[PDB]
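Re: that backbone. Tokens:
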């Protein structure tokens, strides 16, 4: 998607 890394931290 646009940014999955955001789901790992937040």
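Recovered sequence:
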């Amino acid at each position: 998607g646009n940014h999955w890394a955001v789901g790992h931290l937040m």
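The radius of gyration is 6 Å. Residues 3 and 9 are 11 Å apart (CA to CA).
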